[PDB]
Amino acid sequence: ATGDERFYAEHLMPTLQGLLDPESAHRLAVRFTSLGLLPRARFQDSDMLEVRVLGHKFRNPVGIAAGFDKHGEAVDGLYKMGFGFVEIGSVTPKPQEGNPRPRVFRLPEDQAVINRYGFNSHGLSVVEHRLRARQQKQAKLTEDGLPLGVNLGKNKTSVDAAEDYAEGVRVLGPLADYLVVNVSSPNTAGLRSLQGKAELRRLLTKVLQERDGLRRVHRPAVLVKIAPDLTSQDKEDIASVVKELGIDGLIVTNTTVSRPAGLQGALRSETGGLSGKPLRDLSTQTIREMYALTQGRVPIIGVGGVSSGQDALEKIRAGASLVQLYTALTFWGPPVVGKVKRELEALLKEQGFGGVTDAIGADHRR
Ligand SMILES: Cc1cc2nc3c(=O)[nH]c(=O)nc-3n(C[C@H](O)[C@H](O)[C@H](O)COP(=O)(O)O)c2cc1C
Ligand SMILES: CC(C)[C@H]1CC(=O)c2nnn(-c3cc(F)c(-c4cc(CO)ccc4F)c(F)c3)c2C1
Ligand SMILES: CCCCCCCCCCCC[N+](C)(C)[O-]
Ligand SMILES: O=C(O)c1cc(=O)[nH]c(=O)[nH]1
Ligand SMILES: [Cl-]
Ligand SMILES: [Cl-]
Ligand SMILES: [Cl-]
Ligand code: NA
Ligand code: NA
């Protein structure tokens, strides 16, 4: 319990929520972050938190999930905030505006958010040039254990989804440590159908071919990001395809189109993906299942409702090598990053783990 954590949680964030609608608050958050207007993280990462996965060193396992920095404007500010890795996007091939406003809603009683942004994106070319301006800076960050992920989406009016993703691989693959084939946004019509076995195998074969065609030092890992709302059949199929094709990892999960019993927020019946605490254990269980179905051989980035060391460790023990958060930032602000890391370190020690690596999938070993 630092001074900052309580001040943000009790005073700063609630005031900011009281003054600004969620989307305006997000825009401001991105601006402040990009300008480095936040305390440089006091928490120095211990060796216990280092993870080697996806061909890279991660100095800590807590990343910022896709959707916070959709257009790659705040990457350096986000490392300053203490994230061990940054994922930008989703980025679509052509610029597009997304859905009409309002399209983001706070459920404070639930520590949740509902969003239906619809892939608002500056597009590949703008993001390409943004990353190019700091490409060597990123190379040094990556070498120092702070990798960069790029999450790829598809345009609303695209006729050929696989070609949209292929374009993303070719344009931003060379600038990324890993790419994410996001087939699980609930806010683009027909997108989640790309998670079906036949469609997925064809899509991912094309994506991997394009990736393999990049020069070695510009060749990223490829992960698939999946929904929390999959049937058992869907999960079996995804596991099979991912192993068959040698997909490098999974991101588990996106937001849910379900509305768990017990939501209190007035805005609970808004259309969109639900994030935050009501998603937490649904996500953890999806991690648990996907880890088992892939025999622990496919790295998982665990995401959904993380705002504490316990939340993080539950996902790690269920099978995640790394975790991400987003919605917690809306309620706790920047201090939540150091909080999660500090609490995670303490729990690892308490439960007899030498470090994060020892805890990955530990629940499955009884
Ligand atoms: C406002 C908002 C926008 C998001 N945009 C994206 C996106 O563009 N691409 C994506 O893969 N996930 C997106 N997500 C999903 C998050 O990356 C994450 O998977 C999900 O919110 C669960 O984590 P959380 O409970 O910590 O927020 C978005 C989430 C929110 C709340
Ligand atoms: C969809 C998400 C993003 C929004 C949902 C929502 O309704 C909301 N309400 N407040 N808030 C928010 C506002 C902020 F200004 C910061 C922030 C503040 C500082 C100043 O030290 C530095 C960096 C930051 F990111 C923050 F982390 C979250 C959000 C985010
Ligand atoms: C600031 C509000 C705090 C909300 C904290 C919520 C704790 C977990 C309860 C949500 C569980 C949803 N469920 C049933 C799908 O697991
Ligand atoms: O842009 C959006 O609406 C969006 C994309 C995604 O992948 N997940 C989410 O919750 N929203
Ligand atoms: Cl480049
Ligand atoms: Cl060559
Ligand atoms: Cl209702
Ligand atoms: Na299927
Ligand atoms: Na999370």
Our count of domains for the chain comes to 1
At residue 279, φ and ψ (nearest 5 deg) are: -90, -15
Q: Are 108 and 273 in contact (CB under 8 A)?
A: no
Ligand having the closest approach to the CA of 231: 8
Nearest CA to ligand 2 atom 14: 29
C-alpha distance from residue 188 to each of 93, 99, 165, 229, 337 (Å): 14, 10, 14, 15, 30
C-alpha 220 – ligand 9 centre gap (Å) = 23
Closest-approaching ligand to the CA atom of 228: 1
CA of 275, closest atom in ligand 4:
10
* Ligand 3 binding residues, C-beta < 6 A: 110-111, 260, 277-278, 281-282
Between the CA of 213 and the centroid of ligand 6 the distance, in Å, is: 9
**Which ligand sits closest to the CA of 213?**
6
CB 83 within 8 A of CB 43: no
Q: What is the resolution of this structure in A?
A: 1.6
Protein residue whose Cα sits closest to atom 28 of ligand 1: 67
174 C-alpha vs ligand 5 centroid, how far in Å? 6
Decide: 48 in ligand 1 pocket, CB within 6 A.
no
**So which residues are the catalytic ones?**
185
- In eight-state DSSP terms, residue 177 is S
Atom 1 (ligand 4): residue with closest C-alpha?
119
Distance 275 CA to ligand 9 centre (A): 8
Using DSSP bridges, classify how beta strands 51-53 and 56-58 pair: parallel, antiparallel or unpaired. antiparallel
Sign of the torsion formed by the C-alpha atoms of 63, 64, 66 and 70: negative
Q: Is 361 in the pocket of ligand 1 (CB under 6 A)?
A: no
User: Atom 12 (ligand 1): residue with closest C-alpha?
Assistant: 66
- Residues in contact with 213: Cβ distance below 8 Å, sequence separation at least 6, in sequence order: none
CATH number for the domain including 260? Answer: 3.20.20.70
Q: Residue 279: CB within 6 Å of ligand 1?
A: yes
Which residue numbers belong to the known binding site for FMN?
66-70, 90, 151, 182, 225, 253, 276, 305, 326-327
Which residue, chain included where needed, has tokens 């975790």?
323
Whether the Cβ atoms of residue 333 and residue 8 lie closer than 8 Å to each other: yes
**CB 153 within 8 Å of CB 192:** no
222 touches ligand 1 (CB under 6 Å): no
| Distance from C-alpha of 255 to C-alpha of 273, rounded to nearest angstrom | 5
B/e letters for 59-94, b = 16+ CB within 10 Å, e = fewer, are: bbbbbbbbbbbbbbbbbbbbbbbbbbbbbbbbbbbe
Summarize the annotated binding site as residue ranges: 66-70, 90, 115-119, 151, 182-187, 225, 253-255, 276, 305, 326-327
Which residue, chain included where needed, has tokens 């061990």? 84
Q: What method did the depositors use to determine the structure?
A: X-ray
Query: Is the distance from CB of 155 to CB of 96 less than 8 angstroms?
Result: yes
CB of 33 shorter than 6 A to ligand 2: yes
Is the CB of residue 155 below 6 angstroms from any atom belonging to ligand 4?
no
Asked whether 234 and 194 are in contact (CB, 8 A), the reply is: no
178-182 and 221-226 beta bridge pairing:
parallel
Range of the domain at 299: 1-366
Query: Quick check: 284 and 255 in contact, CB under 8 A?
Result: no
